[PDB]
């Protein structure tokens, strides 16, 4: 049961003994393997992610987790190399009981859709997590509901799995084949190598539509079929839209397909402010897509800024307004909307 190691942690340079037990496997995947454990000193639950190797690719997940401190991002407590094939790296992370994907599935299996209030809360904290990494120029590049940790009582969301994460710098190129296929932005389908962090915003728009539809909006069988799925809703891209996604890409004609009206994409009950926000996220043109802070300020979230807002269980909402100056870097003037009067000072 009990296991002991020495690791530095986030804050200092102070390797120290930490002991954990009751270890259980959570899952296997592209991220490696994640275990649950109890830290012996505090009794707190933790998640432990194990991954590697140099392979020919430039991983970055450490050096990104050490830089981040956000209530909507899972925190890195500790890390420690170990045996287990080759050496092994372990990241010790905050444990969170659920994922948005699992909770969205629980509603779908009951032929229920996730309540809008949870759609607003979950989507708002994701964009807030996105605004924070994007202020550092960092792009998550794998925004999918499986990577959205969630505490069901508090409705707190925590972005996780930064194993695809990269700090984008103009003029450096980046692989096009990145991001789970269903959430992959069209620029990536077109082979663009100069893409911005706007791809995460496209992915967040896929998550939003999925939370409204109860199933993924663009389930492609291939990268090429992913573009067909998008076209069936967005309709055929038109130059310059193709040009804005990939300036060097050229000949695409493709039968012209009329866009499906956005009101017909979603069930009739869907509130227009959710449909309208989605239209401003699922744009072909990356520059047309909203910034995360611009999404937070969207009217779809106005209910979260009301003074008389409570979770359906009656608990207070998680903190939504404790913005840092860094978090507001993209547009500090937006704070007047983002911070409602009752939350000021």
């Amino acid at each position: 049961v009990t296991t002991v190691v020495a690791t530095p942690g986030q804050g200092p340079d102070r390797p120290q003994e930490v002991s954990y037990t009751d270890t259980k496997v959570i899952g296997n995947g592209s991220f490696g393997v994640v275990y649950q454990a109890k830290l012996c000193d505090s009794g707190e639950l933790v998640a432990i992610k194990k991954v590697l190797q140099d392979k020919r690719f430039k991983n970055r997940e450490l050096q990104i987790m050490r830089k981040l401190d956000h209530c909507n991002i899972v925190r890195l407590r500790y890390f420690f190399y170990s045996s287990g094939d080759e050496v092994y790296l372990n990241l010790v992370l905050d444990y969170v009981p659920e994922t948005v994907y699992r909770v969205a599935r629980h509603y779908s299996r009951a032929k229920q859709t996730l309540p809008v209030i949870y759609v607003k809360l979950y989507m708002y904290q994701l964009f807030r997590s996105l605004a924070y990494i994007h202020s550092f120029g960092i792009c998550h590049r794998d925004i999918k509901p499986q990577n959205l940790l969630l505490d069901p009582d508090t409705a707190v969301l925590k972005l996780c799995d930064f194993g695809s994460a990269k700090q984008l710098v103009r003029g450096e190129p980046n692989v096009s084949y990145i991001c789970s296929r269903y959430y992959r932005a069209p620029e990536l389908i077109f082979g663009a190598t100069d893409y911005t962090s706007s791809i995460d915003v496209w992915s967040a728009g896929c998550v939003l539509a999925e939370l409204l539809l109860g199933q993924p909006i663009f389930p492609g069988d291939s990268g090429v079929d992913q573009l067909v799925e998008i076209i069936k809703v967005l309709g055929t891209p038109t130059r310059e839209q193709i040009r804005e996604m990939n300036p060097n890409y050229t000949e695409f004609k493709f039968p012209q397909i009329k866009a499906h009206p956005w009101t017909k994409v979603f069930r009739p009950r869907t509130p227009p402010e959710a449909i309208a926000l989605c239209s401003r996220l699922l744009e072909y043109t990356p520059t047309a897509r909203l910034t995360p802070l611009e999404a937070c300020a969207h009217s779809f979230f106005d209910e979260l800024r009301d003074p008389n807002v409570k979770l359906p269980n009656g608990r207070d909402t998680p903190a939504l307004f404790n913005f840092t100056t860094q978090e507001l870097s993209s547009n500090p003037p937006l704070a007047t909307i983002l911070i409602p009067p009752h939350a000021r000072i």
Partner: peptide
């Protein structure tokens, strides 16, 4: 991802 990117190689190298």
């Amino acid at each position: 991802v990117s190689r190298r």
